[PDB]
């Protein structure tokens, strides 16, 4: 049998560790996500202009109840309910935000004559509708400022929800976001990220006790377009005191980086700290299950401590991009201090056991957080953990090898698992000890070993279905919402099969010319490469910029900057129309004949050259070796 | 049994096909390692001050017979009998250099005056014996400049050997590095990168063909003191043109960061290119198995193309930092171009695997180079290699987990090693399975499935046996010289059990402050600090700089450029003696009775924080779960 199983004894019995292990009886957290609630619609249902649906709240409903899941792990479910705490909200005189409506705040600062608006969630129609509701309770004002506190989708994607390029053009509008901005904005492994985060987000599980129950930081992701509005000024260095429609404003740019991607709002009016994505209600990711290249512990650590100094020792109210604000200075400045030590910790004590010989493989099991930091709510990996963090800390300084030949050179699972499975009696013998290691709950021992008959013989009911269980049981027992969705996903995986049927504008003009010709690069299939030599240089007038492009050795080379006189072919055409082609608006004939794609040389080379770039499916095998 | 034995009937045959697969009749090489040699003195042997051998080419003498060892790849049997083409050799009018004196070359070009230096090898004692047979063959000359082309060891660790001080400060001497030669040129996981290094090195290996036959980019490193001289002038930006001692000189730095570690040197007048440890005789690493944070092919394969488009297109000799020169422009042009298309193409191809779902796991045993890359013994894995390069970028793009939850929570091998044994039959019938696997071969498989017995029954003498017997047959195998020791020191480890028995002073001054503190809080015992909250405002006016010390929460964070009113103590110290202090080459209590450390404050925290402070055991068990 394939649907969701109850969870076992085993999983109740992991639940009750919870409930003991952890603080239930500090329900702060409900007293604060419910401060200064202005309204929180009846119902939450947010439309595209396709008609597709955004976002939506419903879903969650059988959270409402209160009632305990054992399907879903406690300290999960606490999480759950409060991101449910949705609306617009008071955090101070002048400053409100709407939560809920995506998967980050929005912030909208009273200015003396209209908004100011700190960031704009993840597609428009959300961004729109939280205008709406800020407008029907608070009276309609104009936006003036939008601020980018970070270079994320989920940050900038709503924008032209609130704003039209004719009001950044006339003036009206300024868009300030961090100095390095555009560099971090925007791919090179996109296809591969985007099909591993289907798991994370399990964009494919119901909502519901057996599927997605929240994601940590919000309740989930808004469905919709993704827009984007380069910013009109940077914020330079470590940062600068601005004034905005009357109101003062003091950035703080992640430290000491030319290019921060990042900045921590400072509003000496309100003594109030908005603290970028940096401090939230959860311990957060170093590296995200996706995969992303794995982050900064220590700057992250020593970034909060500047903060904790510079504007800790002041606030009134901290308030964040994701989750609800904390009042009072005291309260402050623990948090800071624990979130200072959190990332400290993590980082300082990975490395404490890692130069002591425990390796990759084995430092999740080993480190634990001291109870001073353990027993946080707003420490808790529900989005990173302490597990796959402490992992990814030790892999940034070592990599990923654990240093033992036997793992120096090895061979594919799907290349090994015969082997496995035949050392180990055959595929029913290996199934009937995993039985027997189930049914005492040793989930993490059975996910590993009939992780090697799926591969082993991907087509065997029996293995899978096994397999899957087990990896739910895994997944009720999870306090990370990422991982909660990945095994779960893997269940339903391994229980249907993957999916047999199946660009924004905005996010292609923002990417660097250089950036799109190593994405073509990647695109690049090598059967058809080989052997050929062209070289082409590139005139984009509009921007003002000039490439020289080199495919050798089966290799698609970029160089900003260079022409060549041994080109085959000069092509020359905006950045703006070459977009377009990449984006099938327009054809390369039409293009020519509108006088809008000029060629000299060997009209055929460009021609060539995109020809040969293949293309990827985006559902490929996870938990099985390739179809 | 527990020694060295012969290359199986497969191993020979491993080591036939790739004679095969190679092309050996390309012999030029050879006519270029020795090209313009001066003098090869008959005997090598450097002696360090305190009388310790810090080099020595004697023990290399079975390769110089030339004849067939099948023990030892061919290809990297081709690399170790180039590396020993040691000596003083002319590379162009005015253009020396020391080979096989340390790992690294040592150039020294003609000034009018006097001598430009670059690099200075790994320690004193092998600079001065570079310097002497310089001066017995082309007469003594002063040294002018040292010039640092990279913020490497191997290239800054003998500079005490070149020059003094004294003659640093009074300008007799310039020392010149690429700006931010000094954040890069030094820690915190030092112990565990140094331990694995033994294996990567082969520190315990003997020089034969059964143990340690070359390291790739040179023989070996060499047994010294290390060495470090502040430069005086620093090259900023995207470069400099100087002019030293009469000899014109471009510097081009690594692009576009504001801290460039490494640059290449562009020798006008001799049409000379000086490639920085960027092209070598070899696939260089994007990742050392010893550990670090992975490298750039991207921006790698980017830079080389500059270098190209800016000098290869007019030189006519280049060389390089490690191995021996090229001469002729075709030959350097298509040279720079497959270097330059090598880290491209494992860059891009990687990532084309990566898109199609190929996972960390899996793409080191999918990516093949092409022919044009294949083919030229420039390209060769000895050092880095296209296996683990490849699983190196694809980790740099999406880090260690494969996205199969089957692996997202996994059970310490030695935790999950007794089960693996049990569903395989027990001890016996596993090893029984595995010699038979053997015995047709299969290497890779049984040192992955023998090494589950050894971490289930570590002190199982015949699992350890056969998993070394194993290792050592993949270690015979390998081209690459780091993955031959590693294999080799497994098995010796495995055999033989690790030593029961068992810092620079330039390198600490070395170390930016901060990050001195960053490693103190890396050695802090979390056992010994739960629940203490102490914090010292710290004064080093020697330097001009002021740091606050907060121990809270079990972490040690440093703070530069703060104090505070309410910290316990305050102490104020020159960086001179608390370096001192740290080297045990004076204590605390003779500093304070000097004048040397002040004290405000309660006088004890100091020596409580520094009393928390753990160590580590060198010699940590890789091979074997923890004694
Ligand atoms: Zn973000
Ligand atoms: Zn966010
Ligand atoms: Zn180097
Ligand atoms: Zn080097």
């Known amino acids: 049998t394939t649907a969701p199983k109850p969870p076992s004894a085993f999983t109740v019995e992991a639940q009750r560790r919870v409930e003991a292990e952890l603080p239930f009886a500090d329900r702060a957290d409900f007293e604060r996500a419910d401060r200064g ?194 910013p009109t000024r940077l914020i330079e260095g470590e940062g600068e005191d601005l004034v905005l429609d009357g109101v003062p404003f ?34 957060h990711n170093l590296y995200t299950l996706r995969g992303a290249e794995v982050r900064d512990a220590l700057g992250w650590s020593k970034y909060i401590n500047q903060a904790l100094h510079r504007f800790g020792r002041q606030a009134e109210v901290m308030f964040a991009v994701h989750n609800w604000p904390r009042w009072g200075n005291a309260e402050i400045v623990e948090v800071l201090e624990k979130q200072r030590d959190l990332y400290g910790y993590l980082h300082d004590q990975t490395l404490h056991l890692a130069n002591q010989g425990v390796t990759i493989g084995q430092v999740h099991n080993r480190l634990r957080l001291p109870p001073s930091l353990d027993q946080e709510w707003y420490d808790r990996g529900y989005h990173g953990s302490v597990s796959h963090n402490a992992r990814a800390v030790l892999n940034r300084y070592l990599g990923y090898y654990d240093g033992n030949p036997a793992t120096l050179d090895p061979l594919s699972p799907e290349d090994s698992a015969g082997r496995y499975v035949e050392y180990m009696g055959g595929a029913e013998r290996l199934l009937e000890q995993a039985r027997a290691s189930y ?57 249907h099969g993957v999916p047999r049927d199946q660009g924004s504008a905005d996010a292609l003009a923002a990417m660097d010319t250089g950036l799109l010709f190593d994405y073509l690069g990647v695109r690049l299939d090598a059967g058809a490469a080989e052997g050929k030599a062209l070289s082409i240089n590139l005139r984009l007038p509009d921007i003002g910029e000039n490439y020289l492009l080199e495919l050798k050795n089966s290799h698609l080379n970029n160089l900003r900057g260079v022409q060549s006189e041994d080109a085959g072919q000069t092509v020359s055409i905006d950045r703006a129309d070459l977009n377009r082609l990449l984006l099938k608006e327009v054809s390369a004939v039409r293009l020519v004949f509108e006088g809008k794609l000029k060629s000299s040389g060997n009209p055929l080379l460009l021609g060539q050259l995109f020809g040969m770039l293949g293309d990827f499916d985006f559902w490929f095998d996870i938990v099985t070796p390739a179809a």
Chains 1, 2 share one sequence.
Do not use: C
């Open 439 to 495: 049914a005492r709950g040793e989930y993490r021992w059975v996910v590993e070993v009939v992780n090697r008959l799926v591969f082993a013989e991907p087509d065997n009911r029996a293995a899978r279905e096994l397999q899957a269980d087990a990896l739910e049981q895994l997944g009720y027992q999870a306090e990370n919402a990422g991982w909660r969705n990945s095994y779960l996903s893997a269940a339903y995986e391994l229980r």
């Open 250 to 283: 003091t950035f703080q740019n992640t430290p000491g980086t030319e290019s921060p991607a990042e900045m921590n709002i400072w509003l000496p009016r309100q003594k109030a700290l908005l603290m970028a994505e940096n401090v939230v209600g959860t311990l």
């Open 37 to 230: 609630l202005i309204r929180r619609p009846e119902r939450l249902l947010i439309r595209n202009p396709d008609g597709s649906v955004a976002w939506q709240l419903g879903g969650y409903d059988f959270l409402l109840d209160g009632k305990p899941r054992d399907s879903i792990n406690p300290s999960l479910q606490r999480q759950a309910l409060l991101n449910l705490k949705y609306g617009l909200f008071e955090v101070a005189e002048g400053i409100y935000q709407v939560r809920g409506f995506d998967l980050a705040n929005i912030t909208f600062i009273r200015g003396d004559s209209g908004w100011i608006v700190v960031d704009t969630l993840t597609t428009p129609a959300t961004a729109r509708a939280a205008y709406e509701l800020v407008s029907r309770e608070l009276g309609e004002r104009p936006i003036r400022t939008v601020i980018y506190s970070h270079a994320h989708a989920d940050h900038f994607g709503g924008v032209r929800g609130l704003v039209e390029p004719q009001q950044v053009a006339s003036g009206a509008v300024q868009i300030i976001a961090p100095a390095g901005f555009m560099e971090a904005a925007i791919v090179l492994a996109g296809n591969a990220m985007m099909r591993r985060a289907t798991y994370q987000y399990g964009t494919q599980l119901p909502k519901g006790p057996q599927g997605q129950v929240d994601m940590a930081i919000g309740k989930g992701l808004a469905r919709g377009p993704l827009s984007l509005l380069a």
